[PDB]
Amino acid sequence: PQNGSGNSTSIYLEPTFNVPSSELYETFLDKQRILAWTRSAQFFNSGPKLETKEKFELFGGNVISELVSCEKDKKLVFHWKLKDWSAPFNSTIEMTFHESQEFHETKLQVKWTGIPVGEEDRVRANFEEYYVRSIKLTFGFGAVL
Amino acid sequence: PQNGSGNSTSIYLEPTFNVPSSELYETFLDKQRILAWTRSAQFFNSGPKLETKEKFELFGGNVISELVSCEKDKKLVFHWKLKDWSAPFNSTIEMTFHESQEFHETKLQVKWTGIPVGEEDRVRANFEEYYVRSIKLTFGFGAVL
Amino acid sequence: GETFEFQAEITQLMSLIINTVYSNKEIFLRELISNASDALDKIRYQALSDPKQLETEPDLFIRITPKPEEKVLEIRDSGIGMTKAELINNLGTIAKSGTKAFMEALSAGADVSMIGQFGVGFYSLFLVADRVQVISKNNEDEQYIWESNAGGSFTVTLDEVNERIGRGTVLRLFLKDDQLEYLEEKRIKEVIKRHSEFVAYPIQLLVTKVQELEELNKTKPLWTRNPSDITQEEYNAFYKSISNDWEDPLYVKHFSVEGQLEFRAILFIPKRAPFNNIKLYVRRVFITDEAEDLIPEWLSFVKGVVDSEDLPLNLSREMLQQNKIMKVIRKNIVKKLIEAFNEIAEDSEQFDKFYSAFAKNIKLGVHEDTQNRAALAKLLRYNSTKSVDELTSLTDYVTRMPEHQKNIYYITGESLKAVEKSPFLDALKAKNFEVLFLTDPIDEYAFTQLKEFEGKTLVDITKDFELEETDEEKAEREKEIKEYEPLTKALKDILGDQVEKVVVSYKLLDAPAAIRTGQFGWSANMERIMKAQALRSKKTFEISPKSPIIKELKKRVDEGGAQDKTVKDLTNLLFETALLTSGFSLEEPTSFASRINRLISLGLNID
Amino acid sequence: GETFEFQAEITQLMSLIINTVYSNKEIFLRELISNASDALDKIRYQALSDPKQLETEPDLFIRITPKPEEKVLEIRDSGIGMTKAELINNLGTIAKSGTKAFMEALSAGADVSMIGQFGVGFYSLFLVADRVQVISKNNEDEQYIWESNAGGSFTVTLDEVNERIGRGTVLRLFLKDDQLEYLEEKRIKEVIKRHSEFVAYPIQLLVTKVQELEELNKTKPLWTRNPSDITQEEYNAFYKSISNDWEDPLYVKHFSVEGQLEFRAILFIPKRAPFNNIKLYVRRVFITDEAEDLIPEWLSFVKGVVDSEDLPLNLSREMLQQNKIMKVIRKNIVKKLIEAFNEIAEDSEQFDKFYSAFAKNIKLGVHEDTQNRAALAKLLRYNSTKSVDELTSLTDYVTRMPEHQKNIYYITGESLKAVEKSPFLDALKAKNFEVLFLTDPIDEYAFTQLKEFEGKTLVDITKDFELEETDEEKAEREKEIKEYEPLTKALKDILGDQVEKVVVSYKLLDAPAAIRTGQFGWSANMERIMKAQALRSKKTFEISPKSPIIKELKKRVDEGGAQDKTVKDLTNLLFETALLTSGFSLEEPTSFASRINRLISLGLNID
Ligand SMILES: Nc1ncnc2c1ncn2[C@@H]1O[C@H](COP(=O)(O)OP(=O)(O)OP(O)(O)=S)[C@@H](O)[C@H]1O
Ligand SMILES: Nc1ncnc2c1ncn2[C@@H]1O[C@H](COP(=O)(O)OP(=O)(O)OP(O)(O)=S)[C@@H](O)[C@H]1O
Ligand SMILES: [K+]
Ligand SMILES: [K+]
Ligand SMILES: [Mg+2]
Ligand SMILES: [Mg+2]
């Protein structure tokens, strides 16, 4: 038969962060803050923050993400892409804020679609290492034990 | 054939303790200090320290030791005995102090004889737990990591 | 299509089963003792109907005779024995298990459980021996010799040169020249203590001194009996046999589950924290102790054994295959241990020794485990302002809660003395609000995940939190804050970016000022613990409007001394002093000590 | 004596090999792909002498076709194929391995290594399937069908209904109703990524969208090539395939050992600390990753794979038997990684990124490992009084040592700012003695075990240590101490048992007083770290005779104020202040803050 590629899948995670929505929303946009918890970032634009339809390389240029849409402290949608992936493969990740004032926390429900089938555990385990535990240790948005 | 018991064996350990010979020697004799790193001690005599040929129970009365001979800050010989052991089984443990003024350490060469054959690893592993690490954590005679 | 029965290459199957199946070499002794145990279970079963078969050799035992002068390890058993037809069929055929066939031939209602079910465990002896000489003797046959050098064929000869035995089977293992270690007293006792410690029949070892008989299985397993008939000293001896610990177990939990999955587990609780221990047994035979997910990490402080018969044992009996019944046992172990913890909590005298040694383990369970997070919360015991004499529970904290208190107040710190006199308690003591005391670093990790207890939200007083207040107080406090507004503005721009905001707080009655961490973030103790780990935010300046120091500060500001040298030096001194009282380890301690030496010199009239 | 050849019960041997050998169910795919790889190695070997055997099916590949509409998992390969005689002898006989027989028939000097050596790996497919339909086709025979339902016999029928294949073997696995998970795209890719990721032949998977062919082994193993011909991007892609990391490896160490034990190991160093990762391969086949004594705990931060051919694989190829060659590989891994660490140290630009991420790991090795304790000491990099701009090495510390300095001075603390301005440096700076700065809690644990470097004993300045001095200084200092003797006696009995002795120290030039821990015990920072661990002595009061504060203190004592209220309050204030400067967290921080508020009120003329 013909030679090609596989299909895509979708995962859903809810990493709880102890941080107000104001600081957490700006954490994924402030270029000075992003360089802290990522330790590697290549922002193409010369602005102080991230704008709509702006591509930026993370972790030595291996991660390619682009902010396609973002609400005000409520929604964060990015077009996540890995250098190891093929060209037609373009994943989409949505971040919703669910800050709660009773327990002083914020649930960041992550709906990540467009992930290749053979890349599920690679991007999910690393998400708890480069995105969840990295921010909790750099800015102190939650205890890690 | 006849029914009886096995033979005995001997082991040799050198646990290094960061403590002067004066404090380490009194640690195994001072009843107030012994109750600290053992958390369980019952002394037959009502004296302030351990004397020659004095029996005492340790760790809920399961350990029976008796100081048969000791030198001034140099030698500590005890007749160690476990309640699980038979009556003819009586082990002898000798503690020799070696104070190194160059590194401010103290090597306590332990020559433990009279141990049953089927009791080698039981009394050696616990010696590093109830005698070595217990004193290093109670009185701070060395780092534990 | 032509049909062909499956075949097997014998010359290569022997090498695969002997060499490439069993990982450890000492496993050969576990299989021979188990086979001897199975033999002693067949003659004993026949004794229930015909005692004449047992009177030939009434003494049921397993004798091990090491011979260094001949390099032969003899293992004698008084079992049923093997006939001539059985030596060539049960012992000469691979995967032929005569023990399993005897189990299927048992009557309905038998109580004899055997271990032999595969039929290849006998061949494991060739891992340390070159040739074997099996001497068997049955009641309905003569005495024969089964000799084989692990080659391709075996020889069966009528025994006419060895000793005349009554009944049983003798195995003479000609150990290799490099495997002579199994002829020593230490190595033989090690394997029995590891694999055959709880055999139902006495294992005898011929120890030379004068030769004596050493019983290697004096301790009997307690899982075959009901937990009611077992006394306390029996559980103590059992704990000292399964583990190398010298002290008696603090608590013992013996339960039994039946139905779709049957297993008998005897779990012990030591006296102190040992800073996997749960062994798995299958019909009086040790299998392994490397269970991956049999017990959580926070619960690994307990010891004991778990005997079951539905475990999917592999060919070597050294590990368990991937299955779904282990998590069922895990839930039952956690459920029984939590219920056992509640039984300890019923006796205050016993729970004190349990909590003083396993407090960190219980708090770690609340931080890690989520299924029983609310259940383990009933075991947390801490000090408070009203319980400075005993460790009070979280349940008793709610009973002493007034009808107007709806938040559990707690405070972290390095020790008890640093939190018992903290100035953050003056507000809660005026409102008669009890505050928990936290002295361990893991205390905050437990409350970070709990977040609530019996409908009361956990609130840390070190963080910025609002307290109950009436409209009368708010009207008088608001007008007082705006009078100190130039002072708060003066204190803000002097410290720079050290604090986020300077507010007038009313939760301080004695201290003139204090520092509180920003909400939603780490506390003062949490930041100190994270920066002090060997394997490894925002502050708020609060002032008390009732202290004479703050009253004198606002006077100097109104005079025109917002940038005065004395005011700035006093503000920096009061700010760093508040960091020490709040629990912050200020940086550059020499700058603080230099300011103290100046006030010391000025106090001594030294210019 | 009558001789009997060993036999084997076939009806029970099948159940033991299929059910009670392999732990995981997914292992069946690893054995079929390996068998397909072995088949592709036989036809390729024949292509070196007769290309006509390969022209029938030149494309060498492994095709996997899942069929949910039929519940059949087809695995097609273009290998040499099996004849009618081979299907009944190699595939129909247990423990008969035709692949191993082909290896023994190779000529001297061949370069074709195969995996098939046992002969029971084919039967593993019945763990998830009930009946198998093997379709084979060889060049010197016709196309036949090998059908067996895991019973006692198998049927061989001339293929007259299936498709006409050129050359190879097709395996149709009728999976069970409860094992249909292996027909999905996710589960198939998971097993290949886990066990058959580095197959020398392309593995094709028919993925439906429209059906496409997915290559599951695009990444080729680099251990078959020399480390010189491999570029940097090839090592980056190899690291991203063996591990789920997204970043490129910081350093790569590819070495090869020959002789009595041959193994090729490619070890990578990540960019950041991942706060077992070494995989073991045997002839392009993943074995296991749970090797315990393969790499130390302090060295587990690196990743990579180790390919060897002398590993004693068991029957299931899931674990390694107890042997003595693993410790030989462990020493070689440590030796090559330490040598690789030295190569990183040659480039200052690369070692900065390595040290900034793996400093704790190197310091842990000095604390734990003793065989290479002096070797790992060359990697320790810290700040000093003369290197406040860059991390200096211990070797450069000896080069800057004067001819009269014979002790390596260091100081511990919570951060760099707490040790760069410590008053304990005034003595060493006057003597031009460089002092190391320690900011991590594990720093003292490393120097506690090292104790010496290049003949220089490690000395902590926070502890009571004597410095080099001349007879002229001792003559003038001794007479000055006895004049302060009533002062030291006055300071002793006032503090009580808080300190062990009050001595007049000359190692303080600016600070009026300080606290130093007793010798032979823990330091100021060590006591703070031990009491701050989430999983978890003697002090000396030193005074400076050159400060005006101490000069005023001895005056008040001589006047008769040994028990004066002002003297006792000033002594307690100076004592707790010295604890902060030395690094001791003072107890009862409110008593200290209360004394500060009094001096603040007295400074503001508030009575
Ligand atoms: N010491 C013995 N005395 C009497 N019968 C024995 C003895 N050892 C072995 N047998 C018999 O020989 C048969 C074959 O030996 P084994 O290979 O050990 O079979 P097995 O014990 O069922 O296999 P496993 O691995 O223990 S489940 C057993 O089933 C017994 O019937
Ligand atoms: N797909 C195949 N194509 C061609 N020959 C095969 C194939 N699968 C199996 N065989 C042959 O059948 C023999 C028996 O199968 P296996 O049981 O897998 O033997 P094996 O592969 O040597 O055993 P292990 O466990 O993999 S070492 C092999 O030795 C091969 O000669
Ligand atoms: K057998
Ligand atoms: K076969
Ligand atoms: Mg057996
Ligand atoms: Mg195979």
Structure commentary:
The complex is a heterotetramer, with 2 copies of chain A (145 residues) and 2 copies of chain C (607 residues). Chain A is 23% helix and 37% strand. The longest helix of chain A has 12 residues, at 127-138. Chain A has 4 helices and 10 strands, in the order E-E-E-H-H-E-E-E-E-E-E-E-H-H. Chain A has one domain (6-142). Chain A is an alpha+beta fold and 145 residues long. In chain A, strands 2, 3, 4, 5, 6, 7, 8, 9 and 10 form a 9-stranded antiparallel β-sheet that branches. Chain C is α+β, with helices and mostly antiparallel strands. Chain C folds into 3 domains: 1-218, no CATH class; 219-371, no CATH class; 372-607, no CATH class. Helices cover 35% and strands 20% of the residues of chain C. Chain C contains 19 helices and 25 strands. In chain C, the strands form 4 sheets. Chain C has an 8-stranded mixed β-sheet. In chain C, strands 18-17-20-19-22-21 form a 6-stranded mixed β-sheet. In chain C, strand 21 (452-453) and strand 22 (456-460) form a beta hairpin. Chain C is elongated and about 120 Å long. The relative contact order of chain C is 0.06. Bound molecules: phosphothiophosphoric acid-adenylate ester (2 copies), potassium ion (2 copies) and magnesium ion (2 copies). Chains A, B: Residues 1-7 have a biased composition (Polar residues). Chains A, B: It comes from Saccharomyces cerevisiae (strain ATCC 204508 / S288c) (Baker's yeast). Chains A, B: Belongs to the AHA1 family.
